[PDB]
Amino acid sequence: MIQRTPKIQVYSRHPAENGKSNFLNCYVSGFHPSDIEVDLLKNGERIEKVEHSDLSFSKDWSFYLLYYTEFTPTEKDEYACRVNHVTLSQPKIVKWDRDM
Amino acid sequence: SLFNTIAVL
Amino acid sequence: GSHSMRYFFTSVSRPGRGEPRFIAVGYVDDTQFVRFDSDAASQRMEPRAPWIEQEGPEYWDGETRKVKAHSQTHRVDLGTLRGYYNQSEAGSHTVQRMYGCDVGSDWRFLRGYHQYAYDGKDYIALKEDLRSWTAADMAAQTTKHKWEAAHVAEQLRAYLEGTCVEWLRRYLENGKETLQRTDAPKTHMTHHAVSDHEATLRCWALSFYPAEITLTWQRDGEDQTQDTELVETRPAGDGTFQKWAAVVVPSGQEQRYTCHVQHEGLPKPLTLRWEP
């Protein structure tokens, strides 16, 4: 029963430009066991059309998943990824920074 | 192509 | 260069109701090409790269039959393991298996492997000779002795050395336009004022394949580790990868720093310098 907490990165597929369609990614990795809850958020609200990769794992047996959605960035809209996992006492939120 | 027969523990 | 074919299998027990969730994925190098999910409607092995779609119905039928056989083995194993570890029927547990083969740049057999984990730790693995097993604890030791007595490794060895390689070579040729193409990193640098006296330089590598890459910062031609940050290599979603590395520098001293990029796609490493 080892448990490992997820690492999280939130980023766009392409360099973000306001008004140009893009993909918002939430990459979760390093975690065990595999049950995990991931939502992408627009101004705090859960985005409905979110897909994810097929579950796979790394050399140390820890799991990774990509969650993604199409989006069109704008100057004022904020995006984030919210993750819950048995290793977390509460859900973790990471905000999208277009420079990271 | 997968292996045809994985044995049990 | 070298190449590999690897299959990954996860099975998670569901004590409240029903059978274990089973997910299998197959890769050539860093490219996923097939998947199976026991909860999906199709109940079939499914393509995940265009180049596998040219395989005919007998292929899909056979891979479906095999992957479903694998799901049953993992189900039985979850039972056996809960007994070996004296665990209750109440908790969920996980088995993970990976097997496959590497070839060299000549596309001939280099090495085979077959590893198994229980609850995220090593359980039993085939040794590099492909004739005996390594057990991590006394439960797996019982498995090792059973499998050695039964010669479980000999059909597996024949697969890893023969069949696996033949298929990997077939996939490489049928997938040639992508699988035999390297995508060199598309690189650039960004600059971010932190204060009046310090800045951050961030070196970007985008849209590369395969995933293996090295990004290093130097100051006046020596490797610098302090005041740096590197993110884990991450998928773009379109089959390529991304990474960046950053360094914090005194404002006005940016030109001392170089970012060095090494990748299979680059005949010589790239050096980036903020002199814009």
Author numbering:
A (entry chain B): 0 to 99
B (entry chain C): 1 to 9
C (entry chain A): 1 to 276
From the manuscript:
The majority of these studies have focussed on the immunodominant response through the p17 HIV Gag-derived epitope SL9 (amino acids 77–85, sequence SLYNTVATL) (6–23). Instead, in the face of SL9-specific CTL pressure, HIV has been observed to undergo preferred mutation at positions 3, 6, and 8 in the epitope. We add to the existing data by providing the first ever TCR–pMHC structures in this exemplar model of how HIV evades engagement by host TCRs.
Stabilisation of HLA A2 at the T2 cell surface in the continuous presence of 100 µM peptide (steady-state binding) showed that the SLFNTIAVL peptide stabilised HLA A2 with 89% of that seen with the wild-type SL9 peptide after 3 h. This relatively minor difference increased in an overnight assay where stabilisation with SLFNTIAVL was ~65% of that seen with the wild-type peptide. Collectively, our results suggest that the instability of the A2–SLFNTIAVL molecule is likely to provide the major mechanism of escape from SL9-specific CTL.
